């Protein structure tokens, strides 16, 4: 074949790429590397959350558990929980027919509590010459009993003196106090249990006072015609609460001393509780990741990636080194192998390819490729580390009659997810174009430094290569790659060669 | 005239620019085309919403309609609605002076409902040896009557036996049950209507229980001194509800089986209900658009563009082809005509203008321009189609005494709008710079490919044009345009011409 | 030193930088100037808010103030407030033991009130033949007294006739109406004060009706064993309210006409009230800035920068004029002085540096720099001026029992702040890359312009400079700078010089 000038090319060195990204302007762009911004894996189980175990309520509802239905696990030894797991259809709810007042708010406050201790508020003896009602509805191991937290005060010897009890919160923390009223199905039952005419109960702190009378009538709860209503109050430190009754009162025995609460979630049973720990629990499973987005489950609690409605989002890190870059004046070469291999993050080289009489080869330019790795590392770290806010669900606990406020809370969570989801999808598409164009600008900048060093000693072939107008052996090549080439040294030889080339004619003149 | 070299210019072809955009860095930039991102057109009427008609409550309030004020249109035949339209001063509210308990919640749940069916819960005969009170306050076809949904139980022959009724929700769906209590103005009226001393009403499900006694005294509603309180509960499947009364109960007759509810809005009357269908209904009119933003009305319901506080936002799609582009080394030509017309999205071509002895002309480069159309299309489709979230108002239904929560919910809607408003205004400005810059970059790329083809056979005039150093007739120009021109074919002629040009002296040596 | 050709260099003229910023891809980039996007300075005091004074409740709680505890300053003369400052341990609350119903809602609506006036609802005479109860718990002006806004109706001559009174809202505005019920500690006290058996109060509008009976028993408030409960209603124009009692009513005397309410905040005492005015009040102090973000305090009210969780964010405006730009083909010079000084926005100039046999000098290119100032100004103004939404806290007032809605509101506030926080941090990083890159493109364009004018009469040195192939005295330099230089003028000279330099040999041939 005809003789050819020695040649040096500046551009990309990499292997063949398989994995593509999308950019705002282009689809299915092959690049040498990328990262996934979205977490899709999870444990598929309920785990501890940041070292703190949840409580699985098993066969019991929250209400049954918190009031102390003796068919439920006692909470005498509980110290903390991160979240609760509850069976919507748990069999053991309130053992004796009744309801809990404001129980959506109570669920929300006990969804997680970081410091919890059950405490005896008032000893059973304080109420005086009374006895304690028990019921087959609320059995303890086959014996008739009652909620662990309350005392059903009833007549002794057919008398019911006025009873009184009080509790001062001296614990230095918040204390949950529970009490109730039993409403008889008949006047006969009321007369029998409580004796006194027009029984009343009066409960007060220095901030509020409530008075309760009996609401007589037949109800349709299972296993009883009468009915109980349960009430609660969270006392701040220094509060005082007093109870007085001539009949009806289900007296407070045990309360809960609680600190750092409302910090959990009531998740639904089904998914299994496993021995494991995660920094982000969702209803599908626990997530352990350094990714800042997840597309698994909107219902999430803890140190979480933001949920987004998205498929995977691949953030380009490497090079667009495909055959067609030549149409933009860029050079690239493909090679299964180099030496010291390819850099991890960008997979991985700006560099040179040469040809002279001694042969061919490729060589990386470490200094420029390092500035690129730094720029890419800086970009990725800024996108990731600046997302340092709070991204678990915006969510509350609500009961059956709180549909409006439940709906609006869930909508605001959805609206916040919509802003994040669009922003994430666009940032990635935009930044992918900017990263690919950044690699191009970098190699073009290297190409211009070479152009500048070669001056009139080389023809710019417009494809990222230079044809050198003198003999350029491996030592010459290495002076070009290492920035020490001096065009003066070869001026005589180069002007003679340029003259010779200028005179060649494809069709004879 | 003096001799001139044949010439080819690479750049923009288009007609005159009638369309200006703003960019992050410049105002009033003329471009050959853009698209509007914000919808400003609407029907000015209330329409069907994605195939589902609303209900115009006409001269009735929601309360009147829902309890069945006989002056209001029966809902016996209604099966569904997308939203409600209500006159805030409708004359027909509760016909007999009264109130509906928790009516904000009730409004919110009935704002729209996908499957609705009225149902007779309990036959009027079940209540026993009672009669039914009617009233001139509630006339039906001129006759004294009562709400369709309730039965005013009163004595028969100066007897009022205890009445009982119950309803088992066996429907597989949610059942709204309504009931009330009448509170006499005097003990005399209470004795006359209900007979029994201290009459009571007891209503209960297995989940809750309420007991109601009469609250006697004169009220100020129009046409009556007495007063009614209406109450409701939404039963889930399997629930059971019982009624018992010795006087005062306004007994349940008709309830409503409902599925997929709380999905609507209660819009205010004034704007007219037209025969039409839209995917997004606002209080101003229906919006039928593929735009993703609207600036018409914040109160919007359905598959909606997100409401933003903004003027129109023009996204540039076409070319910055103005005379001043030459200051940045770019060529452009303005033509009222080109064979085959201009492309739709960019309203302009990348391409060529030429001059030689045969004459002058312009020609589109189809390959480059097509690549641009793909890029702009992909860009637009991303910006638009990635916004597939839920952008109608974050809003609820609240009554007069629910001001705080209403205020808060509205502020959240507004803050969400403030996020999207800024994001939209800025994205457009930013993306317009990118788009106009991308077009430049694309024609600079063409110009460079030609530069590379012509090599030393053309002088780069720095204005987008090359002065060709040989005769280049139409055939030769087509080889340049179609990428087959071979500089070697004209090497002798081009060298001779260059030598001649270098020898010329404007001012004689 | 050897003879050198005359030279002109195109690029940046400025002083040493001393100012750094970060970009998405690089940290600590020295720039000639930047601006701070985040406000960090505040008054450290409570000020008037946009000309409207707050109210410092001093040693009274809001309840105590609004009901008119005589220990609290009278609000007879108040016309408005922008916000309230309250001691959470204020000693003067309700002077007689009691509670205010729905007091969190009340706090929220009175948090700031733009038009307020106290008004006499019902003259004391209306209630008929009763006397006014007073108490040492509520002393005023040396004597037992009672709340300013209420009258404790008690018997006269051991009779308590049924009292009645009404108020019609004909103010055209909303009117806050307060009433109460006294609950005796004993039957003996009830029979003594009110005489009648089973005393009742009936309070009704045309929209609702409430009946209150006495709740007898001993409470634990300081200084009294009985208890009062206080109620309110906000009447819209046209509303009518009626009161009737046979014992217990604390009758309404003064109410409040209000307009544009719910607009404030209840800040906590501590920070002192000062004679100042600002547009944005935070719990840390007043903020008077045109910046659109602040990192001072999340609890902020008014015309506010958005609170973000961020350090300072420095937006690049000036030039990246550092020695290493020459590696990217760019020229810059550093100088202390230039005729007329540096432009303030970018600090300072695109321009020229020359050298010939008359000496060396720099000169600004005013036309290209002004374009850059316009571009940056336009950028800044878009970023700032398009943030014209509402950015103070998403917040409400709640009482102690309203923990869940308070937590959820505060969470929404936080999640909105999290969006703006990430967005502001990224946007500054991204725009800084784009600003410095824009300045680079601008000077490269000026350089290309000069390149085009010099044509073959100059050697492009690839560092921003041109070696001119002829003598170019200062007049010649000036024709280059002002775009009148004509290469034809120096063609003969330049070709002779080029041919000379081509023949020179560093090592003799
Ligand atoms: C709860 O606290 C109160 C104080 O608020 C206690 O009542 C005081 O009891 C002391 C004697 O221990 C008396 O000297 C005071 O006169 C009482 N003060 C008041 C204001 O009533 C009460 O004993 C404490 N209750 C419990 C269960 O410990
Ligand atoms: C509502 O459901 C209850 C419970 O299924 C029905 O009461 C049952 O009625 C049958 C027929 O008389 C008796 O044999 C059962 O013993 C009853 N069960 C209970 C638990 O009482 C009741 O009839 C249903 N009511 C209506 C109106 O459908
Ligand atoms: C409040 O308004 C009511 C309703 O307008 C007034 O009651 C009317 O008083 C007029 C004038 O004396 C009578 O002729 C009407 O018959 C009344 N109508 C009704 C329905 O009551 C009442 O006087 C007003 N109250 C006050 C204190 O101004
Ligand atoms: C550059 O390469 C030449 C040839 O290998 C070598 O002799 C010289 O030391 C190198 N200079 C630098 C700075 O590495
Ligand atoms: C390009 O134009 C030349 C000159 O007219 C023509 O003969 C040739 O076939 C064309 N080639 C292509 C690839 O269109
Ligand atoms: C440019 O420079 C020349 C020489 O200094 C001067 O005479 C002339 O007026 C200038 N031209 C313009 C257009 O400013």
Task: Please describe what this structure looks like.
Helices cover 22% and strands 31% of the residues of chain A. Chain A is of the alpha+beta class. Chain A has two domains: 1-52 and 272-509, Alpha-Beta Complex (Hemagglutinin Ectodomain, Chain B), CATH 3.90.20; 53-271, Alpha-Beta Complex (Hemagglutinin (Ha1 Chain), Chain: A, domain 1). In chain A, strands 9, 10, 11, 14, 16, 19, 21 and 22 form an eight-stranded mixed beta sheet that branches. In chain A, strands 1, 31, 32, 33, 34 and 35 form a six-stranded mixed beta sheet that branches. In chain A, strands 15-20-17-18 form a four-stranded antiparallel beta sheet, with no helix packed on it. The interface between A and B is large, with 48 and 54 residues. The complex binds a molecule of 2 linked components (NAG-NAG) (3 copies) and 2-acetamido-2-deoxy-beta-D-glucopyranose (NAG) (3 copies). Residues 166, 168, 240 of chain C line the site of a molecule of 2 linked components (NAG-NAG). Chains A, B, C: The record marks 328-329 as: Cleavage. Chains A, B, C: InterPro entries: Capsid_hemagglutn, Hemagglutn_HA1_a/b_dom_sf, Hemagglutn_influenz_A, Hemagglutn_influenz_A/B.
Write the layout of secondary structure elements.
The structure is a homotrimer of 509-residue chains.
Chain A: E1 7-14, E2 20-21, E3 29-30, E4 34-36, E5 38-39, E6 46-49, E7 55-56, H1 62-67, E8 84-86, E9 98-100, H2 103-109, E10 113-120, E11 131-133, E12 135-140, E13 143-145, E14 150-154, E15 163-168, E16 174-183, H3 187-194, E17 200-204, E18 209-213, E19 227-235, E20 240-245, E21 249-252, E22 254-261, E23 266-268, E24 273-278, E25 280-282, E26 286-287, E27 293-294, E28 300-302, E29 306-307, E30 314-316, E31 331-334, E32 349-356, E33 359-364, H4 366-385, H5 403-454, E34 458-460, E35 465-468, H6 474-481, H7 491-503
Parallel strand pairs in A: 1-31, 5-27, 6-24, 7-8, 8-23, 9-19, 27-29
Antiparallel strand pairs in A: 1-32, 1-35, 2-3, 4-30, 10-22, 11-14, 12-13, 14-21, 15-20, 16-19, 16-21, 16-22, 17-18, 17-20, 25-26, 25-28, 32-33, 34-35
The structure holds a molecule of 2 linked components (NAG-NAG) (3 copies) and 2-acetamido-2-deoxy-beta-D-glucopyranose (3 copies).
């Amino acid at each position: 074949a005809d003789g050819i000038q020695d040649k040096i090319c500046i551009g990309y060195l990499s292997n063949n790429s398989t994995d593509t990204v999308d950019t705002l302007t282009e689809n299915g762009v092959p690049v040498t590397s990328s990262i996934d911004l979205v977490e899709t894996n999870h444990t598929g189980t309920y785990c501890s959350l940041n070292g703190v175990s949840p409580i699985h309520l098993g066969d019991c509802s929250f209400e049954g558990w918190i009031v102390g239905n003796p068919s439920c696990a006692s909470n005498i030894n509980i110290r903390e929980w991160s979240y609760l797991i509850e069976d919507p259809n748990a069999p053991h709810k309130l053992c004796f027919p009744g309801e809990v007042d404001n129980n959506g708010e109570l669920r929300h406050l006990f969804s997680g509590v970081n410091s919890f201790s059950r405490t005896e508020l008032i000893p059973p003896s304080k109420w005086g010459d009374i006895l304690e009602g028990t019921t087959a509805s609320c059995q303890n191991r086959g014996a008739n009993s009652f909620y662990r937290n309350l005392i059903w005060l009833v007549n002794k010897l057919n008398k019911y003196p006025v009873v009184k009890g009080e509790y001062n919160n001296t614990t230095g923390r918040d204390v949950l106090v529970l009490w109730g009223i039993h409403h008889p199905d008949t006047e006969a039952t009321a007369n029998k249990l409580y004796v006194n005419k027009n029984p009343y109960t009066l409960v007060s702190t220095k901030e509020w006072s409530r008075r309760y009378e009996l609401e007589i009538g037949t109800r349709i709860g299972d296993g009883q015609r009468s009915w109980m209503k349960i009430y609660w109050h969270l006392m701040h430190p220094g509060e005082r609460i007093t109870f007085e009754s001539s009949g009806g009162l289900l007296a407070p025995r045990y309360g809960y001393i609680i600190e750092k609460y409302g910090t959990g979630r009531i998740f639904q049973s089904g998914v299994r509780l496993a021995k494991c720990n995660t920094k982000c629990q969702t209803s599908m499973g626990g997530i352990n990741t350094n990714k800042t987005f997840q597309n698994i489950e909107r219902n999430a609690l803890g140190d979480c990636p933001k949920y987004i409605k998205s498929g995977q989002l691949k953030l380009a890190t490497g090079l667009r080194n495909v055959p067609s870059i030549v149409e933009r004046g860029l050079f690239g070469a493909i090679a299964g192998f180099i030496e010291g291999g390819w850099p991890g993050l960008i997979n991985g080289w700006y560099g040179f390819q040469h040809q002279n009489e001694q042969g061919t080869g490729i060589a990386a330019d470490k200094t420029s490729t390092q500035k690129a790795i730094n720029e890419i590392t800086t970009k990725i770290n800024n996108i990731i580390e600046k997302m340092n806010g709070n991204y678990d669900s915006i969510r509350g606990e609500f009961n059956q009659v709180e549909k409006r406020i439940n709906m609006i809370a869930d909508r605001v969570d959805d609206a916040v997810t919509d802003i994040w989801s669009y922003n994430a999808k666009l940032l990635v598409l935009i930044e992918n174009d900017r990263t690919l164009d950044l690699h191009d600008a970098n190699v073009r900048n290297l190409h211009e430094q070479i152009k500048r060093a070669l001056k009139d000693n080389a023809i710019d072939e417009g494809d990222g290569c230079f044809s050198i107008l003198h003999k350029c052996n491996d030592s010459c090549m290495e002076t070009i790659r290492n920035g020490t080439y001096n065009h003066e040294d070869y001026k005589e030889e180069s002007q003679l060669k340029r003259q010779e080339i200028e005179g060649i004619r494809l069709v004879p003149r």
